[PDB]
Design a protein around this ligand. Structure first.
Ligand SMILES: CCCCCCCCCCCCCCCCCC(=O)OC[C@H](COP(=O)(O)OCCN)OC(=O)CCCCCCCCCCCCCCCCC
Ligand SMILES: CCCCCCCCCCCCCCCCCCCC
Ligand code: SF4
Lengths: 162, 113, 208, 60, 322, 149
C-alpha cells in the first residue's frame, strides 16, 4: 500500500515535471499519460477504486485522446515553438518558478499543521459511490449533465469548419 | 488474508511477465537479422489541411463518455437506489437523448457534404 | 558453387564474386532452421501491373490454393512483404516506380520475374518497354509464359524455396559475415534434359 | 435509415453468414499441385520441342 | 517450506500457465485464421509445413524474428517502438481478468470490466501513436479515420456492458458468472448481446472495421511503415484481442464455464472457440460498409439502443424486485 | 438473346446488374450455339486465307507455296481502308486498318471504351468521397492496357 503510493507519486511528479519542460507536444502528452496512470495508481493505493478506474477510463482515456487528436489536427512540427525555446531562458521562468515555490512553501506549511491519524486504505466500492451519487447528490448529477450539455453545444458552435 | 495477497502477487507477476515478454520479443526481433542499405529505403511510402469533423467526433465521444460514466456509476446500484434513482436516471437519459437528437438534426453527426 | 553479393550505394549497386562454401555445426543448424522458416513463409507483394498479375491472382485463389505453401498473406506495403513478383511489363514510365518499390523492401528479399515481358521484354520490342526487369534489379527466379500458367508460378515458388533452403545469410547484424551467399544451383534445363529427351509420343491434337 | 431497413439489413447479413457456412459444408475445389498432376489437353501450347521422323531422323 | 508460500507459488504458476496458453492460442489463432478461411473458401489453407500445417506458425515466427527490424530516420523512434507494445499489452491485460475455471483466475478484481474498458482506451492510444509516429500523411489520415471509428464504438461499448452490470448487480466477474447459473445472459440482454458484439468487433480492428484492409488502394494504412517483429506484434495483438473479446463474451453473456455435464473448462473452451469461428464467419461473409455509414450506425443507432436497453433492464429489475 | 437496359441512372449497382444480365444472355447464346452447331469447313476457301489448311499444305504443292509466302513475307492485302467495331466485354472496341498494298498495315488504329470511361471519370466522381472513387473504379470494368495499348 505504501510502496505503490510513494512510487506512483514520485513518478507522477517526475512525469509532470517532464511535461511542463518539454517542446514536443506528443512527447509531453505521453508523459502526462504516464502521470495520469500514476495518479490512478495513487488512487488505487488509497482505496478509491472508482476514482482511479475512472481516471484511466476518461481522464487518461477520453480527454487526452482529444488532445492527441488536436495535435494531429494542427500537425505541430515545431513551428514557433522550438525555434526560440524562450521558456527555457532563466530570465523567463525563474520568476514564476520562485512564485510557485513560495506558494508551495505556504501551502505545505498550512498542510503540515493539521491533524492526521493516517489513511487506513479500506476500499470504497463503486456501489457505494453509485448509492450516494443518486441519493443526496441528485441535483449535482442532473446539473452536471446540464454542464456537459453546455460544453457540448458551445464546442459545436465554435469548432466548425464552414 | 493469504488468498488475496496470492491473487495480488499473481496479478503483479502477470503484469511483469507480459511486459517482459513483449519487450523480449521486440528485442529478439531487433537483435537478429542482417541489415541492408539503399537510397529509397529511408524515403517514405508515397508510392513513388484536413477537416475538423474528427475533432467534433472525438469531443462528442468525450462528453457522451462522461455521461456514460455517470450511467456506469448508476448501474451498479440500481436495486438499492429504488424507483427514485430510476426516475432520476430517466431524466438523465431523456436529456442525453434530447441532446443526441439535437446533434443528429443539425448535421453535427452527419459527416457527408 | 556460391556467389557473394553485398550492396553499397548504372543499377544495380552490387557486385557478385565467386566464393566457395564456408559452411560449427550449431551455426549450420541455426542457418538451416532460419532458412526453413524463411522459405515456409514467403510474403509476396501485391503489385498489379499487367496480365501476368491476373494469372498470379488466378494462382492465389481456391482452385489452385497457393496458400498451402504459406504464401498467401499478400501485403500491400513493400515493407511488410518479402518477395517481389514482377508480373508484368516494365514500361519506361513505370520503371522508376518499380525501382522505388524494390528499394523500399528490406533484406531478406527475393525477386520473381513473371512472363516474357518481365523476363526479356518479350513480344513488345517497342520504344516504351524496357527489355527485361534484370536491366535494373537483380532477379532470383524467372518464369517464361505469356502468361505462365498458375501451376508454373507455384513451380517457380518451389524453385525459390529450395534456392532459399541452400543459401547462407547472416543470423545477426552484430556478429558474423554480413555478405549474402547464394548457391549456384544446377539449372533446370540440363537437370530435366535427362527425361525431356526420352519423350517419344504425345496425344494427337484431334481429341480433347 | 428506418427500422424496416435495419431489420432487412440484419436479415441479409444473417443470410450471407448462413450461405458462407453452407459453402463451408461443401467439397474442396482445389487441385493439389504438385501431388496431383495437372491434366493438360493435347493441343495445349507449352514447351517447344523438335520431333523426329518415323525412320529415326530429325524432321526439320 | 510453508503452505502459504506454496499457495502463492501455485497461484503464480497458474497465472503464468494461463498467460502462456493465451499467447500460444493467439498465434494458433493466426494459424486458425488461415486454416478456417481456407475451410470456408472451399480450399485447404496451409497444410504442408508439418502435419496439416501445424508447423507453419513456427515458420512465420522464425521469419519475423530474423527479418530486419527497421525504424525510419524521419520517424520518431520512441513512439514507433511503443505503439505495438500497447496494442499487444492492452488486450492481453483485458484478458487478464477473465475467470476461465473455478479456482483458475488471475485477478478477482472488484472492477474487472472497467479495467477491460481502460485497456480499450489504451488500444485507441496504440493506434493513434502508430499513426502519428510514422511521419506519413497517408498513415496520418488512415489512423485518424480508424481512431475516430473506434471512439465512435467505444462510446457505447460500456453502455452495452451496463445491462449485464445491472442484471449482475456488481462489477466482479465471479458474480457475473454466478448470476447466469440459472438462465444465460444472452437471452435477456439480447440488445446488449448485439451491441457488445458490434463494439467488440469494431474496437479490435476486425473486419468489417479493419482500417488497413478497408482502403488498400489509397495506400493510407497506418501499418504501411511497420515491418519486422513490430508487424507481427500488431497481428499477435489483434488475434489475442479476438481471444480476449471472445472470452469476455463467454464470461459475460453465455454463462462462462457453467455447463451441465462436461468439465467447466471444456465448456468455456467450446464456447470461446465457437465465438472465434463466429469471428471467422463474420470476417469472410460481411462486406465492409462506408465510413459515414459506420459513423451513423455507431452514433444514431447503437448508442440509443444501449440507453433504451439499460432503461428497460432497470425497469424490469426493479419491477421484479417487489 | 436480349439486350438489357437500365432505368436511366448509371449507378454502380445498375452497371453490375446489367453485366449480370449480360452474363445470363451470354449463357443463352452459348446454349443456342451448343444445341445447333453447323458442320463444315473451319477455314475459308479464299486464296488469301492465312494460313491455308494444314493437310493440304502438307501434301499439295501450290497450297504449300501459298503457305510459304503467307507465313514468311505475309499476305498482300490490296491498298484499301477498313473499319470494324464490335461489342467487347467492356464496351465498343474498334479496329481501323489502312493498307498501302504491302504485307504490313500502313495504319492500325485501335479504339477502346476504357479510354472514354477513364476520361468520363472526373465528370461523375466530382463532389464525392474517396471510397465512392474506389467503388467507381471497381465498377467501370476497365483495364489500363485497354486505355494505353
Ligand atoms: C464476441 C462478440 C462478437 C462475436 C461475432 C458475432 C457478431 C459479429 C458482429 C459484426 C458487426 C458488424 C457491424 C456492421 C454494421 C454496419 C452498419 C452500416 O453502416 O450499414 C450501412 C447500411 C446502409 O446504410 P444506409 O444509410 O441505408 O445507406 C444508404 C446509402 N445507399 O445499412 C445496413 O446495411 C443496415 C443494417 C446494418 C447492420 C445491422 C446489424 C448487423 C449485426 C451484425 C450481424 C450479426 C449476425 C449474427 C451473428 C452471430 C449471432 C450468434
Ligand atoms: C481460448 C481459451 C484460453 C484459455 C486460457 C486459460 C487456460 C487454462 C487451462 C486450465 C485447465 C484446468 C482447468 C481447471 C480444471 C477443470 C478441467 C479439467 C480438465 C481439463
Ligand atoms: S508476358 Fe504476356 S501475359 Fe505477361 S504481361 Fe506480357 S503480354 Fe501480358
Amino acid at each position: 500500500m505504501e510502496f505503490a503510493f510513494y512510487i506512483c507519486g514520485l513518478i507522477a511528479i517526475l512525469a509532470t515535471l517532464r511535461v511542463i519542460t518539454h517542446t514536443n507536444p506528443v512527447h509531453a502528452l505521453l508523459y502526462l499519460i504516464i502521470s495520469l496512470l500514476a495518479i490512478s495508481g495513487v488512487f488505487f493505493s488509497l482505496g478509491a477504486y472508482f476514482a482511479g478506474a475512472l481516471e484511466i477510463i476518461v481522464y487518461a482515456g477520453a480527454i487526452m485522446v482529444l488532445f492527441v487528436f488536436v495535435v494531429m489536427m494542427l500537425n505541430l512540427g515545431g513551428s514557433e515553438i522550438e525555434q526560440e525555446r524562450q521558456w527555457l531562458k532563466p530570465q523567463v521562468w525563474i520568476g514564476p518558478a520562485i512564485l510557485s515555490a513560495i506558494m508551495l512553501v505556504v501551502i505545505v506549511y498550512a498542510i503540515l499543521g493539521v491533524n492526521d491519524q493516517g489513511i487506513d486504505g479500506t476500499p470504497i466500492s463503486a456501489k457505494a459511490v453509485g448509492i450516494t451519487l443518486f441519493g443526496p447528490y441528485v441535483l449535482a448529477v442532473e446539473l452536471a449533465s446540464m454542464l456537459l450539455l453546455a460544453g457540448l453545444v458551445v464546442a459545436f458552435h465554435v469548432g466548425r469548419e464552414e | 488474508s493469504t488468498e488475496v495477497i496470492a491473487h495480488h502477487w499473481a496479478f503483479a507477476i502477470f503484469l511483469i511477465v507480459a511486459i517482459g515478454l513483449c519487450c523480449l520479443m521486440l528485442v529478439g526481433g531487433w537483435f537478429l537479422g542482417g541489415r541492408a542499405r539503399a537510397r529509397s529505403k529511408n524515403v517514405p511510402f508515397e508510392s513513388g489541411r484536413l477537416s475538423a469533423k474528427f475533432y467534433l467526433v472525438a469531443m462528442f465521444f468525450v462528453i457522451f463518455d462522461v455521461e456514460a460514466l455517470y450511467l456506469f456509476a448508476w448501474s451498479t446500484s440500481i436495486r438499492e437506489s429504488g424507483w427514485v434513482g430510476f426516475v432520476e436516471a430517466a431524466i438523465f437519459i431523456f436529456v442525453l437523448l434530447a441532446g443526441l437528437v439535437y446533434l443528429v438534426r443539425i448535421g453535427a453527426l452527419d459527416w457527408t457534404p | 558453387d556460391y556467389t557473394l553479393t553485398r550492396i553499397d550505394p548504372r543499377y544495380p549497386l552490387q557486385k557478385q564474386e565467386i566464393v566457395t562454401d564456408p559452411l560449427n555445426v550449431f551455426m549450420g543448424k541455426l542457418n538451416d532452421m532460419v532458412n526453413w522458416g524463411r522459405k515456409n513463409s514467403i510474403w509476396p507483394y501485391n503489385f498489379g501491373l499487367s496480365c501476368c498479375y491476373v494469372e498470379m491472382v488466378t494462382s492465389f485463389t481456391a482452385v489452385h490454393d497457393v496458400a498451402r505453401f504459406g504464401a498467401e498473406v499478400l501485403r500491400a506495403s513493400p515493407r511488410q512483404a518479402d518477395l517481389m513478383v514482377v508480373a508484368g511489363t516494365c514500361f519506361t514510365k513505370m520503371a522508376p516506380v518499380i525501382q522505388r518499390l524494390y528499394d523500399q523492401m528490406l533484406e531478406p528479399k527475393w525477386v520473381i520475374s513473371m512472363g516474357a515481358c518481365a523476363n526479356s521484354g518479350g513480344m513488345y520490342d517497342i520504344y516504351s518497354v524496357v527489355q527485361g526487369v534484370d536491366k535494373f534489379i537483380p532477379v532470383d527466379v524467372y518464369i517464361p509464359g505469356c502468361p505462365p500458367r498458375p501451376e508454373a508460378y507455384m513451380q517457380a515458388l518451389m524453385l525459390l524455396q529450395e534456392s532459399i533452403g541452400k543459401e547462407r545469410r547472416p543470423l545477426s547484424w552484430v556478429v558474423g559475415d554480413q555478405g549474402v551467399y547464394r548457391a549456384n544451383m544446377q539449372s533446370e534445363r540440363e537437370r530435366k534434359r535427362g527425361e525431356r529427351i526420352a519423350v517419344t509420343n504425345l496425344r494427337t491434337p484431334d481429341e480433347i | 435509415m428506418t427500422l424496416k431497413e435495419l431489420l432487412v439489413g440484419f436479415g441479409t447479413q444473417v443470410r450471407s453468414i448462413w450461405m458462407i457456412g453452407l459453402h463451408a459444408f461443401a467439397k474442396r475445389e482445389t487441385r493439389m499441385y504438385p501431388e496431383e498432376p495437372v491434366y493438360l489437353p493435347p493441343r495445349y501450347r507449352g514447351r517447344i520441342v523438335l520431333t523426329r521422323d518415323p525412320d529415326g531422323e530429325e524432321r526439320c | 517450506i510453508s503452505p502459504e508460500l506454496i499457495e502463492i507459488l501455485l497461484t503464480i504458476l497458474k497465472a503464468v500457465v494461463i498467460l502462456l496458453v493465451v499467447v500460444t492460442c493467439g498465434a494458433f489463432m493466426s494459424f486458425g485464421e488461415r486454416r478456417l478461411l481456407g475451410l470456408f473458401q472451399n480450399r485447404y489453407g496451409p497444410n504442408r509445413v508439418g502435419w496439416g500445417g501445424s508447423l507453419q506458425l513456427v515458420a512465420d515466427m522464425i521469419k519475423m524474428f530474423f527479418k530486419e527490424d527497421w525504424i525510419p530516420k524521419f520517424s520518431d523512434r520512441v513512439i514507433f517502438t511503443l505503439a505495438p507494445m500497447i496494442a499487444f499489452t492492452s488486450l492481453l491485460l483485458a484478458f487478464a481478468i477473465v475467470p476461465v475455471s473455478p479456482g483458475w483466475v488471475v485477478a478477482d478484481l472488484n472492477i474487472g470490466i472497467l479495467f477491460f474498458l481502460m485497456m480499450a482506451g489504451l488500444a485507441v492510444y496504440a493506434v493513434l501513436f502508430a499513426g502519428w509516429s510514422s511521419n506519413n500523411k497517408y498513415s496520418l489520415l488512415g489512423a485518424m479515420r480508424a481512431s475516430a471509428q473506434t471512439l465512435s464504438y467505444e462510446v457505447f461499448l460500456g453502455l452495452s456492458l451496463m445491462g449485464v452490470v445491472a442484471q449482475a448487480g456488481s462489477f466482479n466477474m465471479t458474480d457475473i458468472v454466478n448470476s447466469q447459473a440459472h438462465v444465460w445472459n444472452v437471452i435477456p440482454q439480447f440488445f446488449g448481446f448485439i451491441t457488445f458484439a458490434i463494439a467488440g468487433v469494431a474496437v479490435c480492428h476486425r473486419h468489417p472495421f479493419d482500417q488497413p484492409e478497408a482502403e488498400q488502394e489509397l495506400a493510407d494504412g497506418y501499418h504501411i511503415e511497420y515491418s519486422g517483429m513490430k508487424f507481427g506484434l500488431f497481428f499477435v495483438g489483434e488475434y489475442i484481442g479476438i481471444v480476449t473479446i471472445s472470452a469476455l463474451m463467454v464470461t459475460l453473456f453465455f454463462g462462462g464455464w457453467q455447463g451441465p455435464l462436461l468439465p467447466p473448462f471444456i465448456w468455456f473452451a467450446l464456447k470461446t472457440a465457437f465465438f472465434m469461428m463466429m469471428f471467422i464467419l463474420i470476417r469472410a461473409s460481411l462486406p465492409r460498409p462506408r465510413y459515414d455509414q459506420v459513423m451513423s450506425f455507431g452514433w444514431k443507432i447503437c448508442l440509443p439502443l444501449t440507453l433504451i436497453n439499460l432503461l428497460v433492464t432497470a425497469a424490469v429489475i426493479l419491477w421484479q424486485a417487489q | 438473346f436480349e439486350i438489357p437496359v437500365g432505368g436511366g441512372v448509371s449507378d454502380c449497382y445498375t452497371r453490375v446488374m446489367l453485366k449480370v444480365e449480360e452474363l445470363r444472355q451470354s449463357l443463352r447464346i452459348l446454349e443456342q450455339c451448343l444445341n445447333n452447331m453447323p458442320e463444315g469447313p473451319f477455314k475459308a476457301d479464299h486464296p488469301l486465307t492465312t494460313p491455308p489448311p494444314k493437310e493440304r499444305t502438307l501434301q499439295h504443292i501450290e497450297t504449300l507455296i501459298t503457305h510459304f509466302l503467307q507465313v514468311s513475307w505475309g499476305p498482300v492485302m490490296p491498298a484499301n481502308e477498313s473499319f470494324q467495331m464490335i461489342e467487347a466485354t467492356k464496351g465498343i472496341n474498334s479496329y481501323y486498318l489502312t493498307s498501302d498494298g504491302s504485307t504490313m498495315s500502313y495504319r492500325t488504329r485501335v479504339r477502346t471504351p476504357s479510354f472514354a470511361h477513364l476520361q468520363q471519370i472526373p465528370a461523375a466522381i466530382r463532389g464525392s468521397l474517396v471510397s465512392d472513387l474506389i467503388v467507381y473504379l471497381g465498377s467501370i470494368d476497365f483495364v489500363m492496357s485497354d486505355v494505353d495499348r
